[PDB]
Design a protein around this ligand. Structure first.
Ligand SMILES: CCCCCCCCCCC(CCCCCCCCCC)(CO[C@H]1O[C@@H](CO)[C@H](O[C@@H]2O[C@@H](CO)[C@H](O)[C@@H](O)[C@@H]2O)[C@@H](O)[C@@H]1O)CO[C@H]1O[C@@H](CO)[C@H](O[C@@H]2O[C@@H](CO)[C@H](O)[C@@H](O)[C@@H]2O)[C@@H](O)[C@H]1O
Ligand SMILES: CCCCCCCCCCC(CCCCCCCCCC)(CO[C@H]1O[C@@H](CO)[C@H](O[C@@H]2O[C@@H](CO)[C@H](O)[C@@H](O)[C@@H]2O)[C@@H](O)[C@@H]1O)CO[C@H]1O[C@@H](CO)[C@H](O[C@@H]2O[C@@H](CO)[C@H](O)[C@@H](O)[C@@H]2O)[C@@H](O)[C@H]1O
Ligand SMILES: CCCCCCCCCCCCCCCCCC(=O)OC[C@H](COP(=O)([O-])OCC[N+](C)(C)C)OC(=O)CCCCCCCCCCCCCCCCC
Ligand SMILES: CCCCCCCCCCCCCCCCCC(=O)OC[C@H](COP(=O)([O-])OCC[N+](C)(C)C)OC(=O)CCCCCCCCCCCCCCCCC
Ligand SMILES: CCCCCCCCCCCCCCCCCC(=O)OC[C@H](COP(=O)([O-])OCC[N+](C)(C)C)OC(=O)CCCCCCCCCCCCCCCCC
Ligand SMILES: CCCCCCCCCCCCCCCCCC(=O)OC[C@H](COP(=O)(O)OCCN)OC(=O)CCCCCCCCCCCCCCCCC
Ligand SMILES: CCCCCCCCCCCCCCCCCC(=O)OC[C@H](COP(=O)(O)OCCN)OC(=O)CCCCCCCCCCCCCCCCC
Ligand SMILES: CCCCCCCCCCCCCCCCCC(=O)OC[C@H](COP(=O)(O)OCCN)OC(=O)CCCCCCCCCCCCCCCCC
Ligand SMILES: CCCCCCCCCCCCCCCCCC(=O)OC[C@H](COP(=O)(O)OCCN)OC(=O)CCCCCCCCCCCCCCCCC
Ligand SMILES: CCCCCCCCCCCCCCCCCC(=O)OC[C@H](COP(=O)(O)OCCN)OC(=O)CCCCCCCCCCCCCCCCC
Ligand SMILES: CCCCCCCCCCCCCCCCCC(=O)OC[C@H](COP(=O)(O)OCCN)OC(=O)CCCCCCCCCCCCCCCCC
Lengths: 74, 670, 494, 81, 75
């Protein structure tokens, strides 16, 4: 035998509904909201890290030797 | 498939634990078992795909940590060794999830318990699938956290709280050494990815390899319970029995063994660490086996028995033959998951009780439960032509095969540990099934014998056995303890087997001793462990139920009483630990908070300045009497002092000393 | 109006609206709290816009606005990699600090919000100013608002606490001011772009180093100069404590990058064995001491001391890894210590009215959401992997070990004791028997507010713990500029 | 017997003896969510697995059906004569 | 007791008295033979020992790309 799932989420008794203190508006839409929007813009952000700029130069400089193979020789 | 083996236990653990309200108790059991079984099956295929056809599979997902030289990626790599260790890990985990369907049926926290068991499997799989040391260490810390949460599962019990802190902190000591070890890899090689460390291993400073090698052995020492850091594994038997079987007897304890085996292409070039591998593993065999003989708890005897098998793997690592250690790790895991799960039936059988001094009868009450022990016991003591025979009775021979003082000495040590191995094996078997009933009559009261008059339907409790879910893993594990050892002995031993030509494990040609093991060893020493095993069983079997009083005579002497307790108190490597290590730190913290922080640093600091300056401030103000005649005198004296200083060409140091004096006197009252 | 100047202006507009809205509407207190929260949200939104436009590999200060109307004391703002993430951490933390006190102030709410909003403008100004005197002016400007915050809204011993944090900081800063004035006299200017170009003589660098280090040691704090933290961080209001631990501790760390690494490299190299002895001592003495601390917030306050020693050892490693680890650990400690103070000072202290650990037991039985987040924050405080705390600790400790192995090993031992004190506290509160018999009333679990200021903090540490590249990508080129040394065959190309 | 437990405590793991009347239904929806991610992961692992050795045609290597690296090799290797 | 009403606790007088003694203990520290030695061990000797070892071994080693036939000792 098993019990039915019980418990009050956020302390709200089964009779009533969660009351809003006024922080929910700005926090869920201004704070988190802008944090998802920023995340979307970050996917489209150009990549300006020093590493990828350096790997491209490191590649050619390695292609001048026998370590790597030139896709477009000469 | 290769990456599905990764996420499937993770998903199963997330849904069961974070939505146990939604799927309920049975919903959680359905997902964790299904996700682990589907994952288990895919590993079996991966064994064929990778081990048998020799295709190592590289899978790199995205960079984890990228700083200049360190490029640690969430990369996974399948080779022969990681699929070797994934087989027992998934198989016993499948059998432990299924086994727990019954063991925890009365527990009020089933969803949480099954969530933990699937997270540990995910952390074990991450540990062995990683292609670098840093990502491996995540699973290393992962199984440690999963071990802590599963020991403390009954968190209202104070003694199981102390156990989980012992599990967490003792292992954390090992991880500090391991963390330092990865620093030494990073410092010398630029990164800590496997294909780099082992590509450059034969070429780096020998002293570096010792610095490297020692560190991860200490980390391996903590996670496999070696004589130094070994106290968590038996304390870790405060968790539910399947946790003891899965995490503390067959999978995680074998992480330290796995670390040395994956690092074989590196530590091979350091005999100093390899020699330290040998004797260390040799020591913990007699250390563990002796203590286990004098343990009253069934699980606590078994904990000492795991520590012994792992010690023989650590021993085998020192013999430059890591494949045999790999052979024993898989073989030991099955017999062990058998021994504990079947043991759990015994505790579930009578009263949730596990003390030897109140066990007896039960040979007919639990026929199947007894049978699986005997298969497991003989596999553990390496009875001829069994699963443990092909692994345990090959390490000992390998030690003589290396003809040196270290190789011969550890033989003697291991054989003595092997001698004491069968005694607790006998003690477990005899005192629970083949002995007189030492428990209350409630355990042994069948409805066939008329005892009660009215309450005949109930009040019997005749120590019944378990349901299907409890016995299906018991039967399945029995076959692995008979036929799996023989079937796979050619993959892992063979004569010139090429199962590891992908370099997964590495053996240097100068360190090979396997040829002498098969031929140079003398027949007498090859069959010597069997002679002791089949002999010392009869003395133990004759010392009980036949003589039964020679031992008590030894017990009540002064020599026996001191020996018995010493071995029962586990060599006292926890009394000096608790008092001279743990409480030393606690007193060091006490002294610093009470003498310095709440003490001298306040007196030789803000509090002293506040005391003194208020005193100094009040004395100076007392000279302000508002007596106009007294003020006139002060002006004149200040006038005279300024004339002296400038007219007499005074040293400035005289002036400053005078001011310091005037503060000193003013600092003094009256 | 540069984006950087927008950052300093929004919180000042919020102060204006907070203190004038009653002339346009008895206004409700909820209004003030909503003005203040939205104000910090728009400041976060602007800092996110800046980060999108920010370029990861530029040696020029970015988003600078030309003044050209030179005066004696002008405010120039600019941002590069080393300052960009401290600015983001300040803008993320302060909204969480505002919500963490939504219900627990109940008096002088206007004063609390104005002080909190002013602190945001000052702390942001610290990370954005392009002048060493400008740096000092903002590093110290926060003391009077900090002094009055503790005294207005602090606990029973808030008088001794507010004095300690004011006088410690001033006394140390006065020694930093002396060092800063010597620099401006020799160079004629404290502007970054021209002061870093200069070269100080070794003994000048030596005496410049003591003056600056005395201030940075009071603010780290180092062990033995940390009485103020024990008092202030505990007696402060919860929002104050979050700002004090997650932002104010970082000013000395960011100040090491702008005041000693570029101009005092010889002094830093020749004195590392003194910094490391103090750093090693702080790691052990603090760790042992917090193991015996009985006030839950003081235990969590004392943990900050131990971790601050680890990233203090990193910044003096002269290695790429140590410096990146130091910023990443300082950022990681900002989220995790903020969560642990909300757990202690916000969740436990509001239910019980006490912070003694003796009174807590078995809280998991009635409060499984608190324990779930508390454990994840106790793991992060122990440096467990998949938290940004591990990536920072490992990189910071690797640099410490490589620069000087004896200090690295000792600082490494913190892997044991951080775990030790973090898990031991966790068990005496969440585990370790059934619910404490001292509780007469039963307790409720996390409110929606408490759940979402913890979920937010544990999300930041975990996501950054799995992909720290988000932060490391914008530190690689700028961190490179502060390294001092040369390779035998790469130096002096021709 | 079952130990008494507070009814006011909400735990996401379900609590003391939680089993909702709709447990079978929810266990199916979550399984589907679990299945789809694995399919998403399987598609990833098929695309990005790397192997420097190719399995022989006769051997039991069930991955040749769904991985791209082997399928491209076998497709190209079929062109003989 | 505080500004915001909390739950009713069984505020044990003994534990309350213990937590006040700790907060007030700094006022009662005194210089004695014991307190001078402990305060001199922790503040001077042990730190100066680490400083001695750190000073003496600064630059003693480099592990970077070290090979056989090449030592770790740098000085
Ligand atoms: C967790 C480690 C577990 C334990 C494993 C230890 C394994 C052994 C390593 C020991 C080690 C590694 C550094 C450890 C820390 C580095 C990074 C830390 C860990 C990074 C994670 C520390 O050795 C140091 O010890 C110092 C003691 O003072 C010495 O410094 C100086 O001492 C005085 C002059 O010798 C000065 O007067 C004093 O001014 C210095 O101070 C040096 O011996 C050396 O610097 C290096 O040991 C090696 O050093 C070299 C040179 O000796 C030796 O080579 C030999 O040299 C010829 C004559 O020697 C021999 O003819 C020749 O045959 C051979 O070629 C080796 O044989 C071995 O000894
Ligand atoms: C922890 C306090 C550190 C405060 C930083 C002070 C800022 C730098 C001033 C340190 C100072 C005296 C230090 C005396 C003792 C220091 C305090 C004694 C213990 C304090 C309770 C160095 O003084 C020395 O500097 C040397 C040159 O560098 C000279 O050679 C010496 O002759 C001179 O005495 C002043 O010298 C400095 O003044 C500047 C002119 O703007 C000159 O250009 C340099 O001359 C410069 O160096
Ligand atoms: C590194 C920081 C964490 C990163 C990962 C964050 C979580 C990722 C997913 C983890 C797997 C899912 C875990 C679900 C656990 C069950 C749900 C639960 O919390 O129930 C609370 C349960 C409630 O379950 P309950 O249903 O039994 O509650 C009612 C009964 N009482 C209240 C009496 C218990 O509370 C507890 O009893 C335990 C308190 C501590 C909870 C810790 C749970 C694990 C948290 C994640 C561990 C992550 C390990 C990371 C390892 C790092 C490796 C380097
Ligand atoms: C340079 C690196 C450090 C080198 C020195 C290392 C030692 C550390 C020295 C730190 C000095 C600065 C911190 C002092 C804080 C003490 C504040 C205090 O007294 O409590 C205020 C107390 C609060 O504690 P209280 O309220 O519980 O007790 C006092 C009660 N009344 C207020 C009635 C007196 O209130 C006061 O204002 C009383 C102050 C009286 C005078 C105190 C002078 C102390 C400051 C001396 C500075 C000297 C600098 C040289
Ligand atoms: C931390 C909260 C952030 C907002 C919460 C919502 C997102 C939480 C993370 C959920 C999972 C997101 C990653 C899913 C990965 C799937 C693949 C993918 O989408 O990649 C696309 C992109 C990556 O695309 P990409 O790597 O292929 O290429 C573009 C990026 N460049 C060119 C720069 C390399 O992933 C993201 O953008 C996720 C961003 C998550 C958060 C980023 C940083 C947040 C913290 C900022 C402050 C840090 C300092 C604080 C002080
Ligand atoms: C969790 C699984 C995350 C998804 C895994 C694959 C993500 C992906 O497609 O790549 C996105 C991006 C690129 O990967 P990158 O690190 O730049 O280098 C890979 C070399 N090709 O790498 C990323 O940006 C991945 C970002 C992951 C952020 C953490 C997500 C935590 C989720 C909880
Ligand atoms: C074997 C070598 C033993 C040497 C002889 C030691 C010995 O006999 O000491 C006597 C001691 C007797 O025990 P005790 O408690 O002191 O009796 C007091 C009664 N008035 O007995 C002992 O102390 C013996 C201690 C035995 C345990 C030592 C650890 C195990 C050693 C295994 C070998
Ligand atoms: C700062 C470095 C030392 C910090 C703590 C110093 C200390 O130990 O303070 C104690 C000292 C005397 O206080 P005491 O009288 O013993 O206690 C009051 C009894 N009712 O407290 C004192 O007042 C000592 C005197 C300090 C005088 C400072 C003078 C500053 C100006 C010097 C000018 C020199 C020309
Ligand atoms: C000023 C603190 C130093 C006091 C030195 C001293 O003892 O001189 C005596 C005089 C105060 O006289 P007093 O002993 O207090 O008798 C007062 C009875 N109504 O002390 C005085 O007030 C003399 C005032 C002039 C002090 C000039 C100090 C110059 C320092 C250079
Ligand atoms: C970028 C460079 C910026 C340079 C500075 C520019 C200005 C910065 C702010 C300086 C002071 C501004 C004060 C703003 C509030 C003024 C409006 C006001 O009247 O607020 C009143 C408020 C509540 O009082 P009330 O509502 O009237 O009474 C209700 C009783 N039931 O009562 C209060 O709000 C008082 C709040 C406590 C005091 C403020 C915090 C301590 C400040 C110390 C002042 C000295 C240091 C100044 C530092 C400036 C910034 C560095
Ligand atoms: C349960 C635990 C079982 C043991 C765990 C360890 C597994 C490895 C232990 C040793 C097993 C040895 C192999 C057993 C079967 C040997 C065999 O010869 O099977 C033949 C089968 C055919 O494969 P194929 O390569 O195509 O043959 C071509 C020949 N003309 O070869 C096969 O591949 C068939 C077997 C496929 C099994 C897949 C199971 C998925 C579940």
């Amino acid at each position: 035998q098993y019990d039915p799932p019980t418990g009050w989420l956020w302390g709200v008794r089964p009779g009533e509904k969660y009351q809003n203190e006024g922080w929910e508006g700005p926090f869920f839409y201004g704070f988190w909201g802008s944090l998802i929007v920023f995340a979307i813009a970050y996917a489209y952000k150009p990549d300006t890290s020093i590493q990828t700029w350096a790997l491209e130069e490191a590649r050619r400089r390695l292609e001048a030797e026998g370590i790597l193979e030139d896709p477009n020789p000469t | 498939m290769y990456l599905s083996i990764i996420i499937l236990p993770l998903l199963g653990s997330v849904v069961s634990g974070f939505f146990g309200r939604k799927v309920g108790v049975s919903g959680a059991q359905l997902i964790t078992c299904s996700s682990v079984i589907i994952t288990t099956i895919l590993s079996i295929i991966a064994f064929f795909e990778v081990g048998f056809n020799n295709i190592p599979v590289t899978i790199n997902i995205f960079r984890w940590i990228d700083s200049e030289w360190f490029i640690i990626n969430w990369g996974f790599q399948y080779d022969s060794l990681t699929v070797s260790m994934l087989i027992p890990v998934l198989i016993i985990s499948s059998l432990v999830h299924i086994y727990s369907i019954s063991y925890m049926s009365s527990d009020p926290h089933n969803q949480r318990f099954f969530s933990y068991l699937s997270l540990f499997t995910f952390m074990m799989i991450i540990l062995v699938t990683a292609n670098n040391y840093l990502l491996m260490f995540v699973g290393w810390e992962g199984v440690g956290v999963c071990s802590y949460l599963l020991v403390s599962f009954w968190f209202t019990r104070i003694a199981a709280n102390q156990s989980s802190i012992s599990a967490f902190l003792t292992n954390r000591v090992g991880d500090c050494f391991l963390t330092v070890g990865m620093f030494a890899i990073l410092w010398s090689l630029g990164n800590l990815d496997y294909a780099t460390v082992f590509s450059l291993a034969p070429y780096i400073n020998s002293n570096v390899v010792i610095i490297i090698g020692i560190c991860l052995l200490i980390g391996a020492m903590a996670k496999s319970s070696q004589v130094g850091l070994h106290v968590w594994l038996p304390m870790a038997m405060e968790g539910p029995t399947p946790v003891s079987a899965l995490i503390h007897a067959a999978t995680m304890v074998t992480a330290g063994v796995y670390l040395l085996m994956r690092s074989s292409p590196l530590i091979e070039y350091s005999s100093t660490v390899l020699l330290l591998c040998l004797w260390l593993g040799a020591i913990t065999t007699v250390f563990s086996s002796l203590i286990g003989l004098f343990q009253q708890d069934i699980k606590k005897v078994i904990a000492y028995s795991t520590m012994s098998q792992l010690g023989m793997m650590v021993l085998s690592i020192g013999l430059s033959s890591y494949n045999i250690a790999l052979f024993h790790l898989v073989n030991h895991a099955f017999y062990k998951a058998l021994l504990f799960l079947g043991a759990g039936s015994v505790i579930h059988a009578v009263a949730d009780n596990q003390d030897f001094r109140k066990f007896g009868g039960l040979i007919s009450y639990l026929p199947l439960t007894y049978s699986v022990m005997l298969i497991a016991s003989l596999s553990l003591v390496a009875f001829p032509f069994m699963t443990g025979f092909y692994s345990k009775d090959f390490i000992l021979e390998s030690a003589y095969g290396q003809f040196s003082f270290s190789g011969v000495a550890v033989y003697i040590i291991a054989t003595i540990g092997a001698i004491f191995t069968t005694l607790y094996s006998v003690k477990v078997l005899y005192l629970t099934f083949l002995s007189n009933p030492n428990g209350p009559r409630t355990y042994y009261r069948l409805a066939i014998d008329n005892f009660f008059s009215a309450q005949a339907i109930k009040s019997y409790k005749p120590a019944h056995e378990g349901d299907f879910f409890l016995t299906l893993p018991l039967v399945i594990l029995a076959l692995f303890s008979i036929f799996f050892g023989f079937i796979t002995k050619d993959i892992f031993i063979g004569l010139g087997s090429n199962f590891f030509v992908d370099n997964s494990l590495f053996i240097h040609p100068i360190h090979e001793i396997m040829i002498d093991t098969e031929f140079a060893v003398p027949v007498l020493f090859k069959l010597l462990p069997f002679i002791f095993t089949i002999s010392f069983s009869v003395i133990a079997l004759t010392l009980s139920e036949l003589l039964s009083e020679l031992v008590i005579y030894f017990k009540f002497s002064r020599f026996g009483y001191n020996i018995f307790g010493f071995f029962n108190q586990r060599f006292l490597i926890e009394f000096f630990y608790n008092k001279y290590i743990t409480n030393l730190i606690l007193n060091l913290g006490g002294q610093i908070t009470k003498i310095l922080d709440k003490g001298s640093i306040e007196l030789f600091g803000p509090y002293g300045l506040e005391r003194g300056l208020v005193k100094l401030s009040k004395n100076i103000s007392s000279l302000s009497t508002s007596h106009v005649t007294t003020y006139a005198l002060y002006i004149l004296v200040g006038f005279i002092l300024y004339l002296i200083y400038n007219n007499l060409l005074l040293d400035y140091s005289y002036l400053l000393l005078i001011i310091i004096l005037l503060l000193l006197l003013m600092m003094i009252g009256e | 109006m540069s984006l950087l100047y927008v950052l300093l202006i929004i919180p000042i507009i919020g102060i204006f609206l907070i203190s004038t809205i009653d002339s346009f509407y008895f206004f409700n207190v909820s209004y003030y709290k909503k003005i203040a929260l939205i104000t910090t949200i728009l400041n976060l939104i602007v800092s996110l816009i800046i980060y999108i436009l920010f370029d990861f590999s530029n040696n020029q200060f970015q988003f600078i606005q030309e003044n050209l109307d030179l005066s004696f004391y002008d405010i120039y703002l600019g941002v590069d990699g080393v300052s960009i993430y401290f600015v983001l951490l300040t803008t993320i933390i302060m909204p969480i600090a505002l919500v963490s006190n939504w219900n627990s102030i109940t008096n002088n709410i206007k004063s609390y919000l104005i002080i909190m909003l002013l602190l945001e403008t000052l702390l942001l100004a610290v990370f954005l100013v392009l002048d060493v005197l400008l740096f000092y002016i903002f590093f110290e400007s926060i003391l009077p608002p900090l002094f009055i915050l503790i005294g207005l809204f602090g606990s029973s011993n808030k008088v001794r606490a507010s004095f300690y944090i004011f006088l410690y900081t001033l006394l140390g800063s006065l020694f930093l001011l002396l060092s800063i004035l010597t620099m401006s006299s020799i160079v004629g200017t404290t502007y970054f772009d021209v002061l870093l170009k200069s070269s100080f003589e070794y003994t000048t660098q030596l005496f410049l180093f003591f003056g600056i280090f005395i201030a940075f040691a009071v603010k780290t704090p180092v062990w033995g100069l940390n009485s103020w933290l024990l008092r202030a961080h505990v007696e402060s209001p919860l929002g104050g404590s979050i700002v004090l631990a997650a932002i104010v501790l970082k000013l000395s760390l960011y100040g090491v990058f702008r005041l000693i690494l570029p101009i005092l490299p010889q002094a830093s190299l020749n004195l590392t064995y003194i910094v490391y002895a103090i750093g090693a001592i702080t790691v052990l003495y603090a760790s042992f001491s917090t193991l015996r601390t009985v006030d839950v917030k003081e235990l969590i306050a004392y943990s900050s001391v131990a971790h601050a020693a680890i990233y203090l050892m990193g910044v003096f490693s002269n290695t790429i890894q140590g410096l990146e680890g130091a910023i990443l650990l300082g950022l990681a400690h900002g989220f995790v210590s903020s969560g642990l103070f909300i757990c202690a000072g916000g969740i436990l202290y509001d239910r019980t009215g006490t912070r003694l650990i003796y009174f807590f037991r078995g809280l998991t039985q009635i409060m499984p959401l608190f324990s779930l987040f508390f454990f994840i924050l106790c793991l992060g405080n122990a440096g467990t992997p998949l938290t940004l705390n591990f990536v920072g600790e490992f990189m910071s400790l690797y640099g410490t070990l490589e620069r000087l192995p004896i200090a690295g090993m000792l600082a490494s031992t913190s892997i044991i004791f951080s775990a030790a004190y973090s898990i031991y506290m966790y068990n005496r509160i969440a585990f370790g028997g059934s619910v404490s018999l001292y509780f007469i009333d039963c307790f409720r679990d996390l409110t929606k507010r408490e759940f979402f200021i913890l979920f937010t903090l544990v999300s930041f540490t975990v996501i950054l713990g799995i992909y720290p590249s988000f932060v490391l990508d914008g530190l690689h080129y700028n961190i490179s500029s502060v390294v001092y040394g040369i390779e035998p065959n790469a130096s002096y190309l021709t | 017997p079952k130990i008494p437990y507070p009814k006011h405590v909400w735990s996401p793991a379900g609590g003391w003896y939680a089993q909702p009347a709709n447990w079978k239904q929810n266990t199916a929806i979550f399984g589907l969510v679990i299945f789809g991610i694995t399919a998403m992961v399987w598609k990833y692992s098929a695309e990005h697995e790397v192997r420097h050795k190719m399995p022989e045609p006769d051997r039991f290597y069930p991955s040749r059906y769904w991985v791209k690296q082997i399928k491209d090799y076998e497709r190209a290797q079929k062109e003989k004569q | 007791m505080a500004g915001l009403q909390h739950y009713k606790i069984a505020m044990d007088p003994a534990l309350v008295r213990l937590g006040s003694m700790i907060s007030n203990r700094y006022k009662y520290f005194r210089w004695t033979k014991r307190t001078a030695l402990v305060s001199f061990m922790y503040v001077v000797v042990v730190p100066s020992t680490i400083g001695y070892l750190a000073y003496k071994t600064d630059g003693l080693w480099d592990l970077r790309a070290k090979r056989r036939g090449d030592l770790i000792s740098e000085r």
